[PDB]
Structure formats: C-alpha cells, structure tokens
Design a protein around this ligand. Structure first.
Ligand SMILES: CN1C(=N)N[C@](CCC2CCCCC2)(C[C@H]2CCC[C@@H](NC(=O)Nc3ccccc3)C2)C1=O
Length: 386
C-alpha cells in the first residue's frame, strides 16, 4: 500500500553505496548504514578510522552484550574484522519497533570504508547461509521478523540522480527508499513481475535470455548464470561472467559503432565526456535480461537504458560517465546501476523477487526502462548452474 514513514529514507549513490539511518544501543547511537543485499552480517565501525566521523561505542551502551567471539571477513577487494555482540537496534525512518540483534563491531578493516560515503556500517540483508563466521549468527532481518509482527519482505527503490552530485548535494538529496515489511505503490509504474529466489543464500535468480537492442546474445543460458546470478545493492556495476561480458561488450560496441570509444572506457577505468547536454544516449543500446517467471515455461524481461549502465562522474561543464558493466569470475551480479532502473521487492515470505519500472529511473523523451511479459520460454531450469 502506502508506507510514507519509510519513503525517501535512503541517501547515497551507486559508486559509494545507498544507506539508511539506524540507531544502536541504549541510549541510542545514530549511525548511517549501507544497505547490502549481497551479504548477511550487520557490521559497524566500532573504533576510530580516518574515514569515519562516528562509530559504535559499546562501552556507552547499557544494553550491549559481548558474545566473546571474533569474526574475520575477507572479500575480493578487501576485508573487515571485528568482535561479535548483540544490542538493541532501531530504524528511525522504519517500522516503529526495536529489536535485539547481532552486531559485529568492526575493529580492523582494509578497503571497506569509503572516504566521503557518509556511512559507518553495513546491513547484510541476505540469508544466514552466507553469514560469518557461520549460519548460526542470525542476520538482522531474521531477528526483526522473529521478534515483531513485521511481514517477511522488504523492497528497495535506489534512485540514481542521472548526473554527478557533489559532497553537499549528495548529503541533501533523497537517494531512494527501503520499505521494511511492505510494497509502496507510489515507487513504481506498471506491473510487478516476479522471479523465483532459486536458493536462499544470496538473493539468487535465473536469467534465461539476454538481448542487446532486441538482438539475442544467443549463448547457452547456463553461461548467464555461471556460477550464479544474484541481486546485490552492495555492488555498483552490472557484472557478467567472462564469456557473457565479452559477447555483450562486442554487441554493445557494434550497436554504438557510430562513435569509437577507447579500450579503457570499455574496461570501466576511463571516463568518456560530451559537451553539456549532448550525451548521445540514442546511439547506445537498451539491454534486456529475461528472468524465469513464477509460471511453468513463462519468463518476463527487465530492460535497462544507457542512462542506467553509464554511471555519471565529475570530470569542466561536460557530462561525463564511466561504463558500469564489468567482468566477473563469480557469476552475474545485478548491482546498483541495474537496481536504479527498478523498484525491487525482496519477497522472502514467498521466495521470490519482484521487479517493476522505478518511478525514479533516469530516462529520455524517447525510451524508458521496462518490465514486460509474459514470454514462452522452455527448459528454464537448465539455465541454472550446478
Ligand atoms: C560485493 N560485496 C557485497 N555486496 N558486500 C561485500 C561483502 C560480501 C560478503 C558475501 C558473503 C561472504 C562474506 C563477504 C562488502 C562490500 C559492501 C559494500 C562496500 C564495500 N566497500 C568497498 O568496496 N570499499 C572500498 C574502499 C576503498 C577502496 C576500494 C573499496 C564492501 C562485498 O564484497
């Protein structure tokens, strides 16, 4: 329905992350927390760090409980380490509840915190299977559902501005909404289409067909989900398996061939700039990802524009962008630049993910993002990797 208390409760952007305000401890300590559908730990800065102007002070919380256990979490680009405990947690622009939740107090980290991001911790919203050190550490959302009457569902509207936001603007701007326990109909247009959650660990899905401007990429659909496909608000780019990335870039280059871009642009390293207002959106193709539907032999598609996969960056008065599609060796990742096109419903209760066109997606007068269906698609279970 309508969840006015939670609409517009996010801030941030695709490259630095989207965050929500939370409070931890008694009396409450306010912290900004990155929303991460690609992990399952609630982990907060708990010691001084050059990029933090505040952190969780366990000694100041009367409700802090020490679990006397450490946690070490390496990931591709870095790591975070800390001390496990529990405390009372609330979301000011959220459901009006307070829960007793696990908290990893981060004491050491490498390439975790981001300078100028304005967030001090992360909220891992995925399932217990991928919680660290193991699946016995109950994730926040599981605690929330068990302890309150909050429905087992949340939805995310990540709003890309379509242009660079400076330090002051990104602090003053609305970055989107996280609706806890429901679906807010003001955040999307058209219909919601659902794809099954294949397995409850990451938010894993199955892609059954890929098009570039309606042209079928024509790969064996297992390639699109090798070794998994996930929906992850904690990754910036649309990341594709090596072979899929190579075929997609070849097709995107062919569609946009009226202009030549350097190799560094396609590698997502170098920006491309145009005179103010002259970005040639129309030369770049739309990208359609077909997802397995809830009905046997039925699929639907989500279509994104270059306004989603070209990420605005400051250079001058030129309009500059980075290519936000990159290679992966760990499967497809539908990151923030993809999520910015859609209102995404994480329907844990019904083991499904919903997509609808976002009321805040960036587009032009000629094209819009789309969510359409149904399409007849056979042997979709074969698209999943084992
Ligand atoms: C993809 N991804 C993700 N969605 N969450 C994590 C952890 C995954 C988790 C999966 C289950 C097993 C354990 C690991 C963490 C990520 C969160 C967003 C901010 C990032 N911070 C930076 O990247 N910071 C940074 C800072 C300076 C330089 C470079 C990067 C760090 C990750 O790698």
């Amino acid at each position: 329905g309508s969840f006015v208390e939670m609409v517009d409760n996010l801030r941030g952007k695709s490259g630095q992350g989207y965050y929500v305000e939370m409070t931890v401890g008694s009396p409450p300590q306010t912290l900004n927390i990155l929303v991460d559908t690609g992990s399952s730990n609630f982990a907060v800065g708990a010691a001084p760090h050059p990029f933090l102007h505040r952190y969780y002070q366990r000694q100041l919380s009367s409700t802090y409980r020490d679990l006397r256990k450490g946690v070490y979490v390496p990931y591709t680009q870095g790591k975070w380490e800390g001390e496990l405990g529990t405390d009372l947690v609330s979301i000011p622009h959220g459901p009006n509840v307070t829960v007793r939740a696990n908290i990893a107090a981060i004491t050491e980290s490498d390439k975790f915190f981001i300078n100028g991001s304005n967030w001090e911790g992360i909220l891992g919203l995925a399932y217990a299977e991928i919680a660290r050190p193991d699946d016995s550490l109950e994730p926040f959302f599981d605690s929330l559902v068990k302890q309150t009457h909050v429905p087992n569902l949340f939805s995310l509207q990540l709003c890309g501005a379509g242009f660079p936001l400076n330090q002051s603007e990104v602090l003053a701007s609305v970055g989107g909404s996280m609706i806890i326990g429901g679906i807010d109909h003001s955040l999307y247009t058209g219909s919601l289409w659902y794809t099954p959650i294949r397995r409850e660990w990451y938010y894993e899905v199955i892609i059954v067909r890929v098009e570039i401007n309606g042209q079928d990429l024509k790969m064996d659909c297992k390639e699109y989900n090798y070794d998994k496909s996930i929906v992850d608000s904690g990754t910036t780019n649309l990341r594709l398996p090596k072979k899929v990335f190579e075929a997609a870039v070849k097709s995107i280059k062919a569609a946009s061939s009226t202009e030549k871009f350097p190799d560094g642009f396609w590698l997502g390293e170098q920006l491309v700039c145009w005179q103010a207002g002259t970005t040639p959106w129309n030369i770049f193709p739309v990208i359609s990802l077909y997802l397995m539907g809830e009905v046997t032999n039925q699929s639907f598609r989500i279509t994104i524009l270059p306004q989603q996969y070209l990420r605005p960056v400051e250079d001058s008065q030129d309009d500059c962008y980075k290519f936000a599609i990159s290679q992966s060796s760990t499967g497809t990742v539908m990151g923030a630049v993809i999520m910015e096109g859609f209102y995404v419903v994480f329907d844990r209760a019904r083991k499904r993910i919903g997509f609808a066109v976002s009321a805040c997606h960036v587009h032009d007068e000629f094209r819009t993002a789309a969510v359409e269906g149904p399409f007849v698609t056979l042997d979709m279970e074969d698209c999943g990797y084992n």
